[PDB]
Motif scaffolding. Sequence first.
Motif, short mmCIF file in Angstrom:
data_model
loop_
_atom_site.label_atom_id
_atom_site.label_comp_id
_atom_site.label_asym_id
_atom_site.label_seq_id
_atom_site.Cartn_x
_atom_site.Cartn_y
_atom_site.Cartn_z
N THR A 1 55.41 54.63 47.96
CA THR A 1 56.73 54.54 47.10
C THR A 1 57.44 56.00 47.52
O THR A 1 58.77 55.83 47.10
CB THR A 1 56.48 54.49 45.67
OG1 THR A 1 55.39 55.58 45.27
CG2 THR A 1 56.32 53.30 45.30
N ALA A 2 57.07 57.05 48.14
CA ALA A 2 57.88 58.03 48.31
C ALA A 2 58.55 58.07 49.77
O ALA A 2 59.08 59.01 50.13
CB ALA A 2 57.19 59.32 48.49
N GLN B 1 58.97 61.02 40.11
CA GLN B 1 57.89 61.79 41.23
C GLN B 1 56.91 60.46 41.11
O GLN B 1 56.44 60.04 40.23
CB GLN B 1 57.69 63.07 41.02
CG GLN B 1 58.84 64.11 41.43
CD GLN B 1 59.85 63.88 40.24
OE1 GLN B 1 60.89 64.06 40.73
NE2 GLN B 1 59.61 64.25 39.02
N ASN B 2 56.20 60.61 42.40
CA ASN B 2 55.26 59.76 42.65
C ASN B 2 53.83 60.30 41.99
O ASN B 2 53.88 61.65 41.93
CB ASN B 2 54.76 59.41 44.08
CG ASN B 2 54.76 60.29 44.85
OD1 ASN B 2 55.76 61.37 44.75
ND2 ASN B 2 53.60 60.91 45.75
N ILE C 1 51.47 62.82 44.28
CA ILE C 1 51.99 64.14 44.66
C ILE C 1 53.19 64.24 43.87
O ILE C 1 54.30 63.55 43.94
CB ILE C 1 52.34 64.13 46.17
CG1 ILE C 1 50.82 64.61 46.79
CG2 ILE C 1 53.15 65.24 46.38
CD1 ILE C 1 51.10 64.46 48.51
N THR C 2 53.31 65.60 43.17
CA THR C 2 54.30 65.81 42.36
C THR C 2 55.29 66.25 42.98
O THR C 2 56.57 66.06 42.25
CB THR C 2 54.07 66.38 41.14
OG1 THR C 2 52.65 66.13 40.50
CG2 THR C 2 54.88 66.26 40.00
N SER C 3 55.37 66.51 44.29
CA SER C 3 56.64 67.33 44.93
C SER C 3 57.55 66.23 45.40
O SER C 3 58.53 66.38 45.56
CB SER C 3 55.88 68.30 45.99
OG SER C 3 55.42 69.30 45.58
N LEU C 4 56.68 65.29 46.01
CA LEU C 4 57.84 64.07 46.53
C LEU C 4 58.39 63.29 45.29
O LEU C 4 57.97 63.13 44.29
CB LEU C 4 56.90 63.15 47.48
CG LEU C 4 55.98 63.82 48.54
CD1 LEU C 4 55.04 62.67 49.06
CD2 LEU C 4 56.66 64.11 49.65
N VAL C 5 59.41 62.58 45.82
CA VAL C 5 60.27 61.74 44.90
C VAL C 5 60.26 60.28 45.39
O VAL C 5 59.92 60.11 46.55
CB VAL C 5 61.66 62.23 44.62
CG1 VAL C 5 61.77 63.77 44.36
CG2 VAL C 5 62.43 61.98 46.26
N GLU D 1 66.05 66.16 52.42
CA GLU D 1 64.66 66.56 51.79
C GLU D 1 63.72 67.36 52.86
O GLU D 1 63.72 66.87 54.01
CB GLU D 1 64.21 65.12 51.19
CG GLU D 1 62.89 65.49 50.67
CD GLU D 1 62.10 64.41 50.02
OE1 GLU D 1 62.63 63.32 50.23
OE2 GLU D 1 61.06 64.46 49.38
N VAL E 1 51.59 70.37 48.61
CA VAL E 1 52.83 70.35 49.44
C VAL E 1 53.81 70.73 48.43
O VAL E 1 53.96 70.72 47.24
CB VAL E 1 52.90 68.86 49.72
CG1 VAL E 1 51.71 68.52 50.73
CG2 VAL E 1 53.03 67.95 48.68
N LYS E 2 55.11 70.91 49.04
CA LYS E 2 56.24 71.26 48.28
C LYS E 2 57.66 70.98 48.96
O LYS E 2 57.57 70.66 50.24
CB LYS E 2 56.28 72.92 47.87
CG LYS E 2 56.41 73.75 48.87
CD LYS E 2 56.29 75.29 48.37
CE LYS E 2 55.03 75.64 47.65
NZ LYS E 2 54.74 77.13 47.35
N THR E 3 58.76 70.69 48.21
CA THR E 3 59.97 70.32 48.72
C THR E 3 61.12 70.95 48.26
O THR E 3 61.25 71.74 47.46
CB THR E 3 60.16 68.77 48.27
OG1 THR E 3 59.71 68.65 46.87
CG2 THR E 3 59.13 67.80 48.76
N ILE F 1 56.67 72.58 40.24
CA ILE F 1 56.69 71.50 39.55
C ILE F 1 55.24 70.91 39.51
O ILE F 1 54.78 70.63 40.44
CB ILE F 1 57.63 70.46 40.32
CG1 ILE F 1 57.68 68.88 39.39
CG2 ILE F 1 57.43 70.46 41.72
CD1 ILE F 1 58.80 67.86 40.06
#
Lengths: 50, 50, 439
Positions: free
Chosen positions: A1-2, B8-9, B12-16, C98, C127-129, C358
């Motif tokens: 989904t991302a 966010q998924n 993984i919370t970082s990805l949207v 992104e 991971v991070k964004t 986050i």
Amino acid sequence: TAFVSWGNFESFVSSIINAIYNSAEVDEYEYMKLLVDNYYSKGLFTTVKI
Amino acid sequence: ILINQTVQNDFITSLVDRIGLVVIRQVSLNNPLKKFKKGQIPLGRTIEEI
Amino acid sequence: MRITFNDVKTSLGITESYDIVNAIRNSQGDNFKSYVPLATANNVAEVGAGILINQTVQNDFITSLVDRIGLVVIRQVSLNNPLKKFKKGQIPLGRTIEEIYTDITKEKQYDAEEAEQKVFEREMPNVKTLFHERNRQGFYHQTIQDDSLKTAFVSWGNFESFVSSIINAIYNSAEVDEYEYMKLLVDNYYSKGLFTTVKIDEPTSSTGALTEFVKKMRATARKLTLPQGSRDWNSMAVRTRSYMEDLHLIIDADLEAELDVDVLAKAFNMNRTDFLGNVTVIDGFASTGLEAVLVDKDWFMVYDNLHKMETVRNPRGLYWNYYYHVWQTLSVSRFANAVAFVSGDVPAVTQVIVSPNIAAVKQGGQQQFTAYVRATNAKDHKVVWSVEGGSTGTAITGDGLLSVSGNEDNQLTVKATVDIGTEDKPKLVVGEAVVSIRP
């Protein structure tokens, strides 16, 4: 989904394995440094005062 | 949903989360009385009936 | 109509320190004695500086005849911007960019007995964004009255050259503005406290201070490129490495001159003192303490969205209007190394970074946070942890482990605080993370 593209999906998937290998390399370097630190801690070096 | 917000998924919370489909709604309207219309008047202004 | 001017003097907007004519006339052994033999000294003096507004001058032999203009010169100028090599490609559609980074994991000890019941145990990667978007929209407007401009010229070449110069001025202005924007990027990044600050004494106080600057620069450049990597030179605190061929150092002209005159003209084997990374010289920085900035090539995230030019005509006024529209995205990447060498009084701690910024946890869940303190000195500072959820049963320990109450639904903010001030006036530096709650 991302993701909306399989190329980005697979590119993100491979980075996890890459990170695993990077972590292994970092830990190996840390162990090699710990060898020298432990040798000094046991007092087996020849100490020269500077 | 009115006015979406970024989600966010769960893995993984970082990805949207992205959007995967957009649809444009199209309608056409007609008037039912058009059958009562007469022709065209290219030149002139007034119609006389006797 | 006929626009004319009257009784305009040749001293328009001039504040002279002294009268050179009077100095030459009242010269008795002075340094102006060499100008006494000159005949037309007053005539040369009254015109030599140039004339702003001219007037009709009659011929000295025939009064009716009028002196003419002999030569016309049109000056052309071309301006560029040094920091154009740092620009990326184009973005036709969309707005947001992104950036995704993944970090290393931990190690576990081999245990055959324990492996019996933990075959399917899972642990998530780290991971991070980061996100960037478009932020510049501008245009330049110029008008040209070509029909009425014809009475001021006698040659088509001069007319065309003047029109071409008017056209080129727009591009010159665009280049200047682009350079200013990309310098403002660095100034803003420093002002927001995201650079890694290296505290130097002064680049102009003493030769010892300047050679200490050279030593610290070389040490930092070496420390950036170790093969095993580090997480001490970027704002996201991830394990990453740089390359010497990709490192760019930006300095200013006075620092370059100080280098050349002090520690290179007197240094045998100068290759042991010169700068390491690729050097770019600019006209200084707006910030007070900045002298040099060392960054990675991938630090800049500059893109362009629109570059177009459109014209309109006025049939009644007989002129053209030109509009040049430029739209761009100006941003930087926090995942790259970015060091700033600052001279002056800087705080002991510049920032605090909580590695998971986050997070999303369950009601009966737990989460571990790590705090990185960017300190400019060698003293070690302790952090204090707090949570501002507001509900009872939710608590964070002194080591950064947060446990969530079994019955609550509120957004949680985790705060790591460092005190660098003295008593009766504490100075707190705060790092924050945001936590969401799942049922």
